[PDB]
Amino acid sequence: SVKDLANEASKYEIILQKGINQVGLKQYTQVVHKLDDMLEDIQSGQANREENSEFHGILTHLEQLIKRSEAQLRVYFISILNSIKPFDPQINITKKMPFPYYEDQQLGALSWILDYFHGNSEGSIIQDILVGERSKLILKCMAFLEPFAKESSGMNSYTEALLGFIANEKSLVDDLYSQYTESKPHVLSQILSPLISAYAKLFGANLKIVRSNLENFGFFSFELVESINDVKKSLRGKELQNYNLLQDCTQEVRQVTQSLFRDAIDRIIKKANSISTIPSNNGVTEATVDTMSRLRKFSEYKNGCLGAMDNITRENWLPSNYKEKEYTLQNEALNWEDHNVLLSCFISDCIDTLAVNLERKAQIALMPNQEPDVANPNSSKNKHKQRIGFFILMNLTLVEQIVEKSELNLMLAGEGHSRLERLKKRYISYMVSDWRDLTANLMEGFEDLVSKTKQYKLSDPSLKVTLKSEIISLVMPMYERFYSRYKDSFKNPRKHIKYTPDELTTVLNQLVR
């Protein structure tokens, strides 16, 4: 029945010949079947006949018509995957909108065509395609955010997008394989795989830029982390032929984040000594302004300063050789295991550092060839305490300011504030030095310290009051004694004693300037 089969075949060819789009996919499929059938319906019941197997002419025409048709299926398939041309996601991020997704009917088809091939033991190809296209697309979509991802943070949107994408990708793999819950992982692996590799490059690229200039991009590392974690929190569970690139990155980032503290404590020293002359006004050094501008920068990333506060003793951020005296830590009754206490300590150390170092440079300048006797209100060598005191206080009042105005306040809270306080007291204990002399000395000089003290006005009420009394509650008690005691040894009073304990008390009260 040679001419029989051939005559029927054409009917089909005249069908396939029409566009797949013009023959409800399902039908097109069926026909190709009935054909791959006739192909076999002639290679079985005629292979047995040695005196009959010669329908070679028409047979070949089938093998041909088939291959071609199947190929149009691969094509239709790819056409579908692309019915959602790549787009700029920058908008789906800002106005937090969902990404376009394949319509229902489309999935059906894809699934079908997937079935068509997987059901012919040659779907290992339709697989390669499915994966190829998707990733090529997502990749291109990402291409829009990339340029911005290099330095608001462009790294953020770049991630937000990836996460989003990783999501839609899971869905899609499942919505497509509701029949083959056997290779869902391997498939989604190949799709996400490159997406990540891209993330990784871009990611590593940023760190490279951050490791470079820590002075300004330093804090970005905290963001780099939030980013890499979120990406890792999204992948959790699914397999990834390429995961090590993330475990690597976190290693790189994390390894830059604590580097920030030993570093932070350094800028402060390398910036306090930066200049060796006491400003004309005894005022706020650019250093003081820098360290705060920087500390504050820290506070803005609380959650991140803790995440990378573990496995780090505070030795990890102090000079290799540091004097315990130069700090305000004492009441070691803190649960050093708890990060918060650490973080607070850190901050308090920076402040302490800044304060001490200014005092270093301060003493050096005013009187060199004399080994700087820092942080010691009773220095016998130091003779410019008062000024130095005023000087350091003047910056602290600024330090205090930036603190109260920010997170740094909540971070120090309590212990921090207690140290800060203890610190202020150190330098006020300073300005009062000159008076302890005058007093104990005798047991003119008075007018002297009065004049001198009138030269320093403080931008803070507390200090003024504190200093007023501090002086009073030291000179007076003492003077009254000596006064009234060795007072009457002669006769005429106001003809020798130009000053009366009562008078002095008033004079001292005029020191509100």
UniProtKB/Swiss-Prot annotation:
Quaternary organization: The exocyst complex is composed of SEC3, SEC5, SEC6, SEC8, SEC10, SEC15, EXO70 and EXO84. Interacts with RHO3.
Protein location: Cytoplasmic vesicle, Secretory vesicle; Bud; Bud neck
Name of the protein this chain belongs to: Exocyst complex component EXO70
Note, other: Present with 4280 molecules/cell in log phase SD medium.
Superkingdom of the source species: Eukaryota
UniProt KW keywords: Cytoplasmic vesicle, Exocytosis, Protein transport, Transport
Cited Pfam families: Exo70_C (PF03081), Exo70_N (PF20669)
Keyword Protein transport found: yes
Function recorded in the entry: Involved in the secretory pathway as part of the exocyst complex which tethers secretory vesicles to the sites of exocytosis. Plays a role in the assembly of the exocyst.
One GO cellular component, as annotated: transport vesicle
Keyword Phosphoprotein carried by entry: no
Example of a GO MF term: phosphatidylinositol-4,5-bisphosphate binding
Disulfide bridge map: none
Family from the record: Belongs to the EXO70 family.
GO biological process, one term: exocytosis
